[PDB]
Amino acid sequence: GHMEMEKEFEQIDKSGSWAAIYQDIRHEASDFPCRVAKLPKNKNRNRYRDVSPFDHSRIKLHQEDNDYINASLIKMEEAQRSYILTQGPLPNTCGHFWEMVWEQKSRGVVMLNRVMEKGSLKCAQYWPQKEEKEMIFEDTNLKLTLISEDIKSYYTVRQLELENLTTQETREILHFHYTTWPDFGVPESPASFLNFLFKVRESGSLSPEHGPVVVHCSAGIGRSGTFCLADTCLLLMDKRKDPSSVDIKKVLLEMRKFRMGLIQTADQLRFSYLAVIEGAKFIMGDSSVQDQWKELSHED
Ligand SMILES: CNc1ccc(-c2ccc(C)c(N3CC(=O)NS3(=O)=O)c2)cc1
Ligand SMILES: [Cl-]
Ligand SMILES: [Cl-]
Ligand SMILES: [Cl-]
Ligand SMILES: [Mg+2]
Known part of the structure; x- marks a missing residue:
């Protein structure tokens, strides 16, 4: 067979019109x-002047003081999955970030960037790197401990313990850190990307029994948008067991109702197609393809 999205992909590639297709999405x-x-009081809570959460979908912190964080609830109604997309936290918003994780009952945090990229700090060091050096966020009364980590060639999975120091309740948070995805770039291959996505899926972090997974890169729109678009499209396909009922551009436009700028280049859009098309193999019952991705991704 041949999915409709596969036919579309070939036509776009052939005519060389990824830029046009992508720019039309931006215009719409x-x-x-x-x-x-x-607001002036929130100036220092924003990493980028021009990347802001819409009011209607912003995550509110539960604190009478200042409830603002640069984070958006992407609520995909048809797919029945939610994501929180957020900027890489700043030195003064790490407490807020973990506060959000707590209040929203997230189980998983997905990080698609490195702390330093292109000679610049794109994200604060908001989690502990050594077991014996836990972090206390005094402003939000939270304690964060590194429990263990599994380092692969291009991504790292960490177990963290988040404690609300007010109630002494503790939760396990899983950190999925993609370390080789360049800003304004694409993963090395659909295989490496899907291997990672499926690692997030397998953990149970995307379950509806949990709060929305938190997804961020530096701005929380480019790589973050790519990750969520691929996952949502695969989920929609999955619910209906019908790949040809998935309109990737339409799904992206729906996501952009909840946060601006999701997917930052034409090639990231192109890559999103590649990931969904390849991932469709697993969804439609080629169970062995997951091992192929693992091998191809060279995670060891
Ligand atoms: C609307 N204007 C605007 C757009 C984009 C950015 C911006 C800056 C720096 C970075 C690393 C990224 N990202 C590109 C990627 O692929 N992921 S990202 O971190 O969101 C985006 C800033 C302002
Ligand atoms: Cl890093
Ligand atoms: Cl660098
Ligand atoms: Cl920073
Ligand atoms: Mg040690």
Whole structure:
């Protein structure tokens, strides 16, 4: 057979029109107000002047003081999966970030960037790197401990313990850290990307019994958007067991109702197609393809 998205992909490649297709998505994308993000008191809570959560979908912190964090709830109604997309936390918003994880009952955090990229700090060091050096976030009364980590060639999975120091309740948070995805770039292959995505899936972190997974890169729109678009499209395909009922551009436009700028280049859009098309093999019952991805990704 041949999926409709596969036929579309070939036509676009052939005519060399990924830029045009992508720019049309940008032109059609939703425009909603971000008035809270732009308040003077929130200036230092934003990593990028021009990347803001819409008011209607922003995550509110549960604190009468200042409830603002640069984070958006991407609620995919048809797919029945939610994601929280957020910027890489700043030195002064790491407490807020873990506060959000707590209040939203997230089980998993997906990090698609490195702390330093291109000679610059794209994300604060918001988790402990050594077991014996735990982090206390005094402003939000949270304690964070590294429990263990499994380092692979291009991604790292960490077990963290998050403790609400007010109630002494503790939770296991899983950290899935993709370390080789360049900003404004694409993963090395669909295989490496899907191997990682399926690692996130297998952990149970995307279960509806949990809060939304937290997904971030530096701005929380480029690589983050790519990750979520692929996952949602595979999920939609999965629910219906029908790949040809999935309209990737339409899904992306729906996601952009909840946060601006999701997917930052034409090639990331192109890569999203590649990931979904390849991932469809597993969804539709080629169970052995997951091992192929593992081998091809060279995680060892
Ligand atoms: C709307 N204007 C705008 C767009 C993008 C950015 C921006 C800056 C730096 C970075 C690393 C990224 N990212 C590209 C990627 O692939 N992921 S990202 O971190 O979101 C985006 C800033 C402002
Ligand atoms: Cl890093
Ligand atoms: Cl560097
Ligand atoms: Cl930083
Ligand atoms: Mg040690």
